[PDB]
C-alpha cells in the first residue's frame, strides 16, 4: 500500500501541552528525558529569537538519535526549513568544505515572501515586427519594435514590444493563436499553449489547449513564495533570469559550486532586511542536522566554531556514537564523541539511553504493526529475546524476511518456525564474526 | 553478448515455495544462500519496504557475484539493477557522497504511464514553409487512408523528422505523436517518373484502412537519476551520456521527490524499486559507509546488496581492523548471507555446466582430472583451463578434450601455488620489495 | 560493410528548371534540377530533387567544379575545380582536384573498421550542431 523505510512509524515527539513525554506516543518508546529535551529545543526554534544554538545527541548505535532529529523535523512542520546532512557530505571536489558548510548554513534559513507580479497574458492575435532603417549598421538590432495583440476574456490590448522582450517571446516559439504569459518582473515569457477557440484535432505535437485567461490583459497578482538565503545567494552568484547576455549564457554553462563571498551574503542580508522592513517578508529560521558528526575533520570543526557566533546562523543538531575517539585530521587529541572541546564548550549535549527488553519488544510490535505483518505472542517474545541477544536493528530487519517466509507457506501470521528459519538463513554481525575467526581461507 | 564468467546463470533455480533445486537455472548447490537470495528477490518484487542492506559474505571463488547475477536475472526486465564496483565511487569530478547518491537513485525506477496517438496512413501532399535562413519551419501534412483524409499542422520537430528519412508524397508512414517518431513503413503509389538521384528500392506496402488516428497507452520506466540529470540543467540529456553532471544540488533532488510523489498521487506514474549491487564493498572509505548508513534510512532507497571476500581486515580510511572490512554501524543495519565452499561433486557439475556453456565436449576422465585439479587448486583456475584445453584439442584436430589436453594445459599454464613456488625457488631473478635483482646469470 | 550509390564528376551543366504553372509571390518555382556530370570514359545528366538546389547554392557549386553526390541523402559536396580549369586566373586559392576515374555512377563496397571506444566517443559528444 505504502512504503516504509527504517522510519515513518514516528510522527512526532509525543508530548502533551506541558512538555512531558508519554511512554508510547507518536511511535516513540522510552527516552523520556531525551524527548523532553528535544521538545524544549523545538520550542526554542519556534521562538525564532536565537542564532547559533547547537545541541549534540550522544548515545550508542541504534538508540534513537536520528529518530529524535526526524521527530524534531516532523514536530516543527514543513514550513520550517530542515536540512539533514551527513558529515562526509561536506567533502566536495568542486568547492572547499568551508564553503559547503556555509552553504548548508544558509540553506537552513528560509523566509516567506509576499511577492507581487506584473503580468501581461492573453491570446496572441497579431504579431507584426517593425524593421529598422539600417539592419547592417553593426550596432542596434535588426528590428525596432514588435506589435503584439493580446486578447483575454472581457478585454483586449495591443503592446509595442522592446526587441529584448521579443527575444524571450521568440525563444518559446510564440505564433499567432497561442496563449502566452509575459512576466514583467524578469521579462520571462511562458507559452501556455494553443488557444481552444480554433480547431483542436488537427495538430501533430500533443500540445496543450488552454481557454481564454479571465480578467484584464495587464494584471498585478500577489504570490507567496518560500525561499532560503542560499537560494538567493546562488541566484545572485550564477545570474539567470534576466534577458541580458550574461543571464542567457548562465543557463547554458555547466553549473559549478563557487566560493560565495562575504560581500554578496551581506548584500543579500541587507536586501532581505529591507524586505522585512517593508513587511512583505518574514524570516523563518530552521534546523541544520549533521548526522555522524564524528567524520568532520578539524578544519570544518574550527569553521563551525567560527560560524556558530554569526548573527544569522540556524539551530544546529549534531549526532555521534563515539566514546573517546581522536578527531579526524589530528594525531594526538582524545576528545569525547569525536568533537573537540572548543566546540563541546558551545554545545548542549543530550544523552540518549539504551533500551530494555520490554521496550525492544514493543518497538518490534509497533514496527510489525506499521509493516502490516501479524505476529503471535510466542514469536514476538522470541524476537524480543533475539533482539536483546544480538541487536535491535537485526531483529527489526528480520521482520520482512519473516513475513516473506510466512507468505511462501500461504499463511498470514508469523510463527516461531518463521523466526527460526530467518535466524538460520540470515546472520548478524556476531555470528558472522565467529565464522570469520574459524576459517583458514579469508572469508 | 559473448561468453562471460556468469553467462551460464539465468535465474536462481527456485520453485514456488522458494526451495532451491540442487541443479537448476545454472546455479548449483549453495541452498542456504540461494534460498536467502530468493527471499531477497521476493522482498524486492514485493516492493513494500525500502532501504534494506544485504551482505553476501564468503571466501573467494564461491558464488557471491554469481548469486547477485542470479538475483538480477530473476529480477526480470523493467526493474533497475545497478551493479557497481567498490572503486567506481572515487572520482575526480564527483564527491564520494554524490557518487553514492547517484548510484542509489539509479536503482529507483519511475514507471510513467503515457497517453499517445498513432497516425498511420498514405501521404498525399506535403507543404513545408521555411524562412530564408531555414530557422522557422511550419507547414501542413495531408495524409489519408482508404477511408479517411486529414490535413494536419506541422511544427519544427515534425518537419525535422519529415525531412529526415524523406517521404515523397505516396510513402506510408507511421507517426507516434507523444514520442515524435516517424517510421516510413514503405512506398505505396510507386511513381513512374522517379528522380534518378536516390536508391529507390523501397518496400511496397498497401495503404492502411480504417481509423487514421488511434489512441494508445504506453508505459516506460525512467530512473530517478535520469530525472535529476534532466532537470539539473538545460542540456541534461547529453550529460546523461557524457556523465558531466557535476554535484547536482539538493534542491533539485527534493523538488523531484515532491514531483514523483505528486505523480504517484495523480496515478500518472508508479515507483518501481530496484537493487543496487556494490561488488567488492570493502574497497570503500569510512566516509562512504557513514553516508550509506544514512542513505539507507531514506524512503527512496533501493535494496542494497553488498559482496565482500575479506575476513577481519583493515577498514579503508582508518587504522583499525573490522569484520569484512566494514564498521559495526553498517554491520548493525545489514543482513548477512553466508556462502560456503564447495565439495568435489559441486565443483564437478559446475565445471560440467561451464563446459556445456562454452560448447566444449569433455570426456569423463578429463572431467575427473579437472575436478581433481579444481580441488587441489581453486575452482576458477580449472574453469579457465577448459577453453585452453579446448583450443589444444582443436589444434590436434579432434572435437573432444581428452586427458592429455588437460595435462598439456596444466603444464603450459600455471596456477597460483606453482608460480609462488617457482618465484620462491628463484628469488634472485625477480625484483623483490627492496628492488634487488640479479639480471646476470654468471 | 556498406553499399553506396555515388554520383561524382565535373559539373557540365546546372539548370534549375521552372514549373509549368509557377505560383505567385515567389521567384523561380523550381520543378526539378538538371545537373550534368562528366567523368572518365563517360558522362551522364541527372534529374534531381528540387530541394537539392538550396544545397547547391549553399555549398557554392559552380560550372566546372567536381562534386560528390550520394544517393539517399542528397547532400552535395564539392571537392574542387577540375584540373582542366586551372590556367584562367593567375592567382586563386582553391586546389584543382583531378578529373575522377571510373564511371559517373558506381556502387563501391566499403569496409569500415572502428573500435567500440570510437562509437562511445562519437555518441558521447553529439553531432555537429548549431548551438553555442
Amino acid at each position: 500500500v505504502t512504503r516504509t523505510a527504517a522510519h515513518t512509524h514516528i510522527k512526532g515527539l509525543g508530548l502533551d501541552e506541558s512538555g512531558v513525554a508519554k511512554r508510547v506516543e507518536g511511535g516513540f518508546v522510552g527516552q523520556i528525558e531525551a524527548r523532553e529535551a528535544c521538545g524544549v529545543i523545538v520550542d526554542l526554534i519556534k521562538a525564532k529569537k536565537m542564532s547559533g544554538r547547537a545541541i549534540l545527541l550522544a548515545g550508542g548505535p541504534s538508540t534513537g538519535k536520528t529518530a529524535l532529529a526526524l521527530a524534531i523535523s516532523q514536530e516543527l512542520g514543513p514550513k520550517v526549513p530542515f536540512c539533514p546532512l551527513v558529515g562526509s557530505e561536506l567533502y566536495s571536489v568542486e568547492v572547499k568544505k568551508t564553503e559547503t558548510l556555509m552553504e548548508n548554513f544558509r540553506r537552513a534559513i528560509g523566509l516567506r515572501i509576499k511577492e507581487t507580479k506584473e503580468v501581461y497574458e492573453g491570446e496572441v492575435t497579431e504579431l507584426t515586427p517593425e524593421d529598422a532603417e539600417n539592419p547592417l549598421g553593426g550596432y542596434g538590432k535588426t528590428i525596432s519594435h514588435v506589435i503584439v495583440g493580446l486578447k483575454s476574456a472581457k478585454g483586449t490590448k495591443t503592446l509595442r514590444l522592446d526587441p529584448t522582450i521579443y527575444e524571450s517571446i521568440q525563444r518559446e516559439k510564440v505564433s499567432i493563436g497561442d496563449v502566452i504569459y509575459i512576466e514583467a518582473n524578469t521579462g520571462a515569457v511562458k507559452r501556455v499553449g494553443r488557444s481552444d477557440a480554433y480547431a483542436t484535432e488537427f495538430d501533430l505535437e500533443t500540445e496543450e489547449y488552454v481557454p481564454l485567461p479571465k480578467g484584464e490583459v495587464h494584471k498585478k497578482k500577489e504570490i507567496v513564495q518560500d525561499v532560503t538565503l542560499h537560494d538567493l545567494d546562488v541566484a545572485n552568484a550564477r545570474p539567470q533570469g534576466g534577458q541580458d547576455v550574461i543571464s542567457m549564457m548562465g543557463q547554458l554553462l555547466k553549473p559549478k559550486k563557487t566560493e560565495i563571498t562575504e560581500k554578496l551574503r551581506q548584500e543579500v542580508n541587507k536586501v532581505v532586511a529591507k524586505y522585512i522592513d517593508q513587511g512583505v517578508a518574514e524570516l523563518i529560521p530552521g534546523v541544520l542536522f549533521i548526522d555522524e558528526v564524528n567524520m568532520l575533520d578539524i578544519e570544518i570543526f574550527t569553521y563551525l566554531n567560527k560560524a556558530l557566533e554569526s548573527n544569522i546562523a540556524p539551530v544546529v543538531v549534531l549526532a555521534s556514537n563515539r566514546g573517546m575517539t581522536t578527531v579526524r585530521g589530528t594525531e594526538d587529541v582524545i576528545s569525547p564523541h569525536g568533537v573537540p572541546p572548543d566546540l563541546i564548550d558551545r554545545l548542549l549535549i543530550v544523552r540518549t539511553l539504551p533500551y530494555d527488553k520490554d521496550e525492544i519488544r514493543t518497538i518490534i510490535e509497533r514496527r510489525a504493526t506499521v509493516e502490516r505483518l501479524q505476529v503471535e505472542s510466542s514469536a514476538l517474545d522470541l524476537l524480543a529475546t533475539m533482539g536483546t541477544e544480538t541487536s535491535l536493528r537485526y531483529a527489526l530487519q528480520l521482520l520482512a524476511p519473516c513475513g516473506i517466509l510466512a507468505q511462501t507457506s500461504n499463511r498470514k501470521e508469523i510463527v516461531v518456525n518463521d523466526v527460526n528459519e530467518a535466524k538460520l538463513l540470515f546472520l548478524d554481525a556476531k555470528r558472522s564474526t565467529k565464522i570469520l575467526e574459524t576459517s583458514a581461507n579469508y572469508l | 553478448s559473448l561468453i562471460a564468467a556468469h553467462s551460464h546463470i539465468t535465474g536462481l533455480g527456485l520453485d514456488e515455495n522458494l526451495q532451491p533445486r540442487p541443479t537448476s537455472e545454472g546455479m548449483v548447490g549453495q541452498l542456504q544462500a540461494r534460498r536467502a537470495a530468493g527471499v531477497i528477490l521476493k522482498m524486492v518484487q514485493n516492493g513494500t519496504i525500502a532501504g534494506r542492506a544485504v551482505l553476501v559474505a564468503g571466501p573467494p571463488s564461491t558464488g557471491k557475484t554469481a548469486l547477485a547475477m542470479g538475483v538480477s536475472q530473476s529480477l526480470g526486465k523493467d526493474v533497475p539493477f545497478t551493479a557497481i564496483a567498490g572503486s567506481e565511487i572515487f572520482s575526480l569530478e564527483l564527491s564520494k557522497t554524490e557518487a553514492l547518491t547517484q548510484a542509489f537513485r539509479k536503482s529507483i525506477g519511475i514507471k510513467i504511464k503515457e497517453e499517445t496517438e498513432l497516425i498511420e496512413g498514405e501521404v498525399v501532399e506535403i507543404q513545408i514553409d521555411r524562412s530564408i535562413t531555414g530557422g522557422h519551419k511550419q507547414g501542413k501534412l495531408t495524409i489519408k487512408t482508404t477511408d479517411m483524409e486529414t490535413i494536419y499542422e506541422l511544427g519544427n520537430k515534425m518537419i525535422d523528422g519529415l525531412t529526415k528519412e524523406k517521404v515523397l508524397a505516396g510513402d506510408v508512414i507511421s507517426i507516434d505523436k507523444a514520442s515524435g517518431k516517424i517510421t516510413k513503413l514503405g512506398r505505396s503509389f510507386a511513381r513512374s517518373r522517379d528522380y534518378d538521384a536516390m536508391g529507390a528500392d523501397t518496400r511496397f506496402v498497401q495503404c492502411p484502412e480504417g481509423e487514421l488516428q488511434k489512441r494508445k497507452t504506453v508505459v516506460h520506466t525512467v530512473s530517478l537519476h535520469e530525472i535529476d540529470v534532466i532537470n539539473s540543467r538545460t542540456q541534461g540529456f547529453l550529460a546523461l551520456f557524457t556523465g558531466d553532471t557535476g554535484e547536482i544540488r539538493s534542491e533539485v533532488r527534493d523538488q523531484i521527490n515532491t514531483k514523483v510523489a505528486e505523480w504517484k498521487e495523480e496515478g500518472k506514474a508508479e515507483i518501481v524499486p530496484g537493487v543496487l549491487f556494490i561488488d567488492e564493498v570493502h574497497m570503500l572509505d569510512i566516509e562512504c559507509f557513514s553516508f550509506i548508513n544514512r542513505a539507507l534510512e531514506d524512503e527512496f532507497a533501493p535494496i542494497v546488496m553488498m559482496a565482500t571476500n575479506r575476513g577481519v581486515s583493515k577498514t579503508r580510511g582508518t587504522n583499525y581492523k573490522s569484520p569484512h572490512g566494514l564498521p559495526l554501524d553498517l554491520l548493525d543495519r545489514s543482513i548477512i548471507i553466508t556462502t560456503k565452499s564447495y565439495n568435489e561433486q559441486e565443483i564437478k557439475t559446475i565445471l560440467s555446466i561451464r563446459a556445456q556453456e562454452e560448447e566444449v565436449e569433455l570426456s569423463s576422465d578429463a572431467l575427473d582430472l579437472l575436478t581433481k585439479t579444481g580441488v587441489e587448486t581453486s575452482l576458477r583456475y580449472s574453469s579457465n583451463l577448459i577453453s585452453v584445453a579446448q583450443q589444444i584439442a582443436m589444434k590436434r584436430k579432434n572435437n573432444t578434450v581428452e586427458v592429455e589436453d588437460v595435462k598439456r594445459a596444466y603444464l603450459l599454464f600455471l596456477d597460483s601455488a606453482r608460480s609462488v613456488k617457482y618465484v620462491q625457488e628463484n628469488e634472485s631473478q625477480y625484483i623483490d620489495d627492496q628492488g634487488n635483482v640479479q639480471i646476470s646469470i654468471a | 560493410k556498406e553499399t553506396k550509390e555515388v554520383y561524382e564528376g565535373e559539373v557540365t551543366e546546372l539548370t534549375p528548371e521552372d514549373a509549368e504553372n509557377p505560383l505567385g509571390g515567389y521567384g523561380k518555382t523550381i520543378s526539378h534540377v538538371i545537373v550534368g556530370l562528366k567523368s572518365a570514359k563517360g558522362t551522364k545528366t541527372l534529374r534531381l530533387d528540387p530541394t537539392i538546389y538550396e544545397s547547391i547554392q549553399r555549398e557554392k557549386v559552380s560550372i566546372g567544379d567536381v562534386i560528390y553526390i550520394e544517393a539517399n541523402t542528397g547532400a552535395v559536396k564539392r571537392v574542387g575545380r577540375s584540373d582542366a580549369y586551372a590556367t584562367e586566373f593567375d592567382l586563386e586559392t582553391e586546389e584543382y582536384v583531378p578529373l575522377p576515374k571510373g564511371e559517373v555512377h558506381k556502387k563501391k563496397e566499403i569496409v569500415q573498421d572502428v573500435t567500440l571506444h570510437d562509437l562511445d566517443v562519437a555518441n558521447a559528444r553529439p553531432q555537429g550542431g548549431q548551438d553555442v
Binding site: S175, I176, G177, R194, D196, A197, Y198, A199, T200, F202 | V123, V124, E125, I126, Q127, I128, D129, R130, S131, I132, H136, Q138, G139, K140, E153, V167, L168, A169, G170, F189, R191, R193 | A19, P22, L23, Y26, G27, K28, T29, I30, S31, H32, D49, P50, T51, Y53, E54
Partner: peptide
Amino acid sequence: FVKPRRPYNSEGMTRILRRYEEDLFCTF
C-alpha cells in the same frame, strides 16, 4: 458547433510542395 481552423500565416517564407506526380520548390 464546429470550431474554425487556426489562421495560417506564411508571408515571405520559402515554399516546398510534394505532390503525387511532381515536387515544387518555390524559393525567392
